[PDB]
Design an enzyme around this catalytic site. Structure first.
Site, PDB file in Angstrom:
ATOM      1  N   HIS A 177       0.801  -1.218   0.000  1.00  0.00           N
ATOM      2  CA  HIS A 177       0.000   0.000   0.000  1.00  0.00           C
ATOM      3  C   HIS A 177       0.836   1.271   0.000  1.00  0.00           C
ATOM      4  O   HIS A 177       0.321   2.355  -0.265  1.00  0.00           O
ATOM      5  CB  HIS A 177      -0.997   0.014   1.167  1.00  0.00           C
ATOM      6  CG  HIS A 177      -0.449   0.555   2.454  1.00  0.00           C
ATOM      7  ND1 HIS A 177      -0.140  -0.251   3.530  1.00  0.00           N
ATOM      8  CD2 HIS A 177      -0.219   1.827   2.860  1.00  0.00           C
ATOM      9  CE1 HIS A 177       0.250   0.499   4.545  1.00  0.00           C
ATOM     10  NE2 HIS A 177       0.212   1.764   4.166  1.00  0.00           N
ATOM     11  N   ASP A 235      -0.809  -7.031   2.134  1.00  0.00           N
ATOM     12  CA  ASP A 235      -0.025  -5.811   2.224  1.00  0.00           C
ATOM     13  C   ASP A 235       1.447  -6.166   2.397  1.00  0.00           C
ATOM     14  O   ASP A 235       1.989  -6.099   3.501  1.00  0.00           O
ATOM     15  CB  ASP A 235      -0.500  -4.988   3.412  1.00  0.00           C
ATOM     16  CG  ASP A 235      -0.239  -3.520   3.233  1.00  0.00           C
ATOM     17  OD1 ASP A 235       0.455  -3.164   2.251  1.00  0.00           O
ATOM     18  OD2 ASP A 235      -0.731  -2.731   4.072  1.00  0.00           O
ATOM     19  N   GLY A 265       2.749   6.441   9.088  1.00  0.00           N
ATOM     20  CA  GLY A 265       4.146   6.709   8.795  1.00  0.00           C
ATOM     21  C   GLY A 265       5.049   5.537   9.187  1.00  0.00           C
ATOM     22  O   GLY A 265       6.206   5.462   8.756  1.00  0.00           O
ATOM     23  N   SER A 310       4.153   2.414   8.534  1.00  0.00           N
ATOM     24  CA  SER A 310       3.846   1.383   7.534  1.00  0.00           C
ATOM     25  C   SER A 310       5.064   0.798   6.828  1.00  0.00           C
ATOM     26  O   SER A 310       6.000   1.517   6.479  1.00  0.00           O
ATOM     27  CB  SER A 310       2.908   1.939   6.455  1.00  0.00           C
ATOM     28  OG  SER A 310       1.629   2.245   6.971  1.00  0.00           O
TER      29      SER A 310
HETATM   30  N1  LIG Z   1      -1.304   0.130  15.049  1.00  0.00           N
HETATM   31  C1  LIG Z   1      -2.056   1.115  14.510  1.00  0.00           C
HETATM   32  N2  LIG Z   1      -3.029   1.568  15.326  1.00  0.00           N
HETATM   33  C2  LIG Z   1      -1.789   1.588  13.202  1.00  0.00           C
HETATM   34  C3  LIG Z   1      -0.715   0.984  12.465  1.00  0.00           C
HETATM   35  C4  LIG Z   1      -0.379   1.406  11.163  1.00  0.00           C
HETATM   36  C5  LIG Z   1      -1.092   2.454  10.529  1.00  0.00           C
HETATM   37  C6  LIG Z   1      -0.679   2.877   9.129  1.00  0.00           C
HETATM   38  N3  LIG Z   1      -1.601   2.512   8.089  1.00  0.00           N
HETATM   39  C7  LIG Z   1      -2.613   3.370   7.711  1.00  0.00           C
HETATM   40  O1  LIG Z   1      -2.825   4.456   8.192  1.00  0.00           O
HETATM   41  C8  LIG Z   1      -3.486   2.859   6.596  1.00  0.00           C
HETATM   42  C9  LIG Z   1      -3.073   3.621   5.328  1.00  0.00           C
HETATM   43  O2  LIG Z   1      -3.846   3.211   4.214  1.00  0.00           O
HETATM   44  C10 LIG Z   1      -3.862   4.273   3.257  1.00  0.00           C
HETATM   45  C11 LIG Z   1      -4.227   3.709   1.884  1.00  0.00           C
HETATM   46  C12 LIG Z   1      -5.601   3.498   1.537  1.00  0.00           C
HETATM   47  C13 LIG Z   1      -5.938   2.972   0.257  1.00  0.00           C
HETATM   48  C14 LIG Z   1      -4.910   2.655  -0.680  1.00  0.00           C
HETATM   49  C15 LIG Z   1      -3.539   2.866  -0.337  1.00  0.00           C
HETATM   50  C16 LIG Z   1      -3.196   3.393   0.946  1.00  0.00           C
HETATM   51  N4  LIG Z   1      -4.905   3.080   6.809  1.00  0.00           N
HETATM   52  C17 LIG Z   1      -5.577   2.499   7.896  1.00  0.00           C
HETATM   53  O3  LIG Z   1      -5.013   1.787   8.707  1.00  0.00           O
HETATM   54  C18 LIG Z   1      -7.072   2.805   8.032  1.00  0.00           C
HETATM   55  C19 LIG Z   1      -7.981   1.573   7.894  1.00  0.00           C
HETATM   56  O4  LIG Z   1      -7.725   0.989   6.640  1.00  0.00           O
HETATM   57  N5  LIG Z   1      -7.465   3.378   9.289  1.00  0.00           N
HETATM   58  S1  LIG Z   1      -7.152   4.869   9.928  1.00  0.00           S
HETATM   59  O5  LIG Z   1      -7.687   5.807   8.980  1.00  0.00           O
HETATM   60  O6  LIG Z   1      -7.872   4.809  11.219  1.00  0.00           O
HETATM   61  C20 LIG Z   1      -5.364   5.076  10.023  1.00  0.00           C
HETATM   62  C21 LIG Z   1      -5.049   6.502  10.629  1.00  0.00           C
HETATM   63  C22 LIG Z   1      -4.973   6.807  12.014  1.00  0.00           C
HETATM   64  C23 LIG Z   1      -4.669   8.127  12.431  1.00  0.00           C
HETATM   65  C24 LIG Z   1      -4.442   9.139  11.464  1.00  0.00           C
HETATM   66  C25 LIG Z   1      -4.516   8.853  10.081  1.00  0.00           C
HETATM   67  C26 LIG Z   1      -4.821   7.524   9.662  1.00  0.00           C
HETATM   68  C27 LIG Z   1      -2.171   3.070  11.260  1.00  0.00           C
HETATM   69  C28 LIG Z   1      -2.530   2.653  12.585  1.00  0.00           C
END
Ligand SMILES: N=C(N)c1ccc(CNC(=O)[C@H](COCc2ccccc2)NC(=O)[C@@H](CO)NS(=O)(=O)Cc2ccccc2)cc1
Length: 247
Positions: free
Chosen positions: A46, A97, A196, A198
């Site tokens: 992703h 992923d 960030g 990821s």
């Molecule tokens: N351990 C954790 N809590 C945690 C670990 C890793 C991540 C990084 N990954 C992402 O953000 C991925 C990125 O995907 C983008 C994308 C979408 C579509 C196509 C390509 C890329 N998205 C998520 O996870 C989504 C659900 O699919 N949930 S969220 O929106 O609640 C994450 C978030 C939290 C706070 C601020 C901004 C975003 C976030 C949280």
């Protein structure tokens, strides 16, 4: 990383920092990754799905800071960007992923082992740690959900592996999480990986040995109660990994 502590590449020698060049002249941080062999870095699909152009990426090894150099660092081009063909993103879940970046320096060489650059071991087919085990994660990700900038210094923290049954509860993720993923979090819900981080590594000590157990993929929010981080289960991708790293 929410919480945790600042560290140095010396303590996470297998950590790879991936950046992207821009039309102008600025290079922005994209995702973390792990060096699994001299010429290979493993990360998350992703991170590159929207810009599959290998020429626009730069991979750093032996780097402890986000926007500044570190003695002993090595810069690399991406000879080959391999994304997973069955990657897809649903409401919350990100499936398959995982991604491989073949690297090479301008001289055409791969990584040279040093004290700040080493490979991480891959797990055995379907051989993961027991649930309740402690593992570490590393990243240049957000320190708080409300930040819009990434910390300047690398960070790390420790989390616990959560059973597939617990993570499948209604108040958790329900059926969004599959057996191809692993959940992990802090029992106090204080520390966690975030945006960030990821592509970064989820490292666990398996039978006396540091193993690349998972890859930071998704999660609802950051360090929210009953919302663990979800990681790509590396052990269930060994075949895909081997067939693509050959020739
Ligand atoms: N351990 C954790 N809590 C945690 C670990 C890793 C991540 C990084 N990954 C992402 O953000 C991925 C990125 O995907 C983008 C994308 C979408 C579509 C196509 C390509 C890329 N998205 C998520 O996870 C989504 C659900 O699919 N949930 S969220 O929106 O609640 C994450 C978030 C939290 C706070 C601020 C901004 C975003 C976030 C949280």
């Amino acid at each position: 990383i929410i919480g945790g502590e600042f560290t140095t590449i010396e303590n996470q020698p297998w950590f790879a920092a991936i950046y992207r060049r821009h039309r102008g002249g600025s290079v922005t941080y994209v995702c973390g990754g792990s060096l699994i062999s001299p010429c290979w870095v493993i990360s998350a699909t992703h991170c590159f799905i929207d810009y599959p152009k290998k020429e626009d990426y730069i991979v750093y090894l032996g780097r402890s800071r986000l926007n500044s150099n570190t003695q002993g660092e090595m810069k690399f081009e991406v000879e080959n960007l391999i994304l997973h063909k069955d990657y897809s993103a649903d409401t919350l879940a990100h499936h398959n992923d995982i991604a491989l970046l073949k690297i090479r320096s301008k001289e055409g060489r791969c990584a040279q082992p040093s004290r700040t650059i080493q490979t991480i071991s891959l797990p055995s087919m379907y051989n993961d740690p027991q649930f309740g085990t402690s593992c570490e994660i590393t990243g240049f990700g957000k320190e708080n959900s409300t930040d819009y900038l990434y910390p300047e210094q690398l960070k790390m923290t420790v989390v616990k592996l959560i059973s597939h049954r617990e993570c499948q509860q209604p108040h958790y993720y329900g059926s969004e999480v599959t057996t191809k993923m692993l959940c992990a979090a802090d029992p106090q819900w204080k520390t966690d990986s975030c945006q960030g981080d990821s592509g970064g590594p989820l490292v666990c000590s398996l039978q006396g040995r540091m193993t690349l157990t998972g890859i930071v993929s998704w999660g609802r929010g950051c360090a929210l109660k009953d919302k663990p981080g979800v990681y790509t289960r590396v052990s269930h991708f060994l075949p895909w990994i081997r067939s693509h790293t050959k020739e």
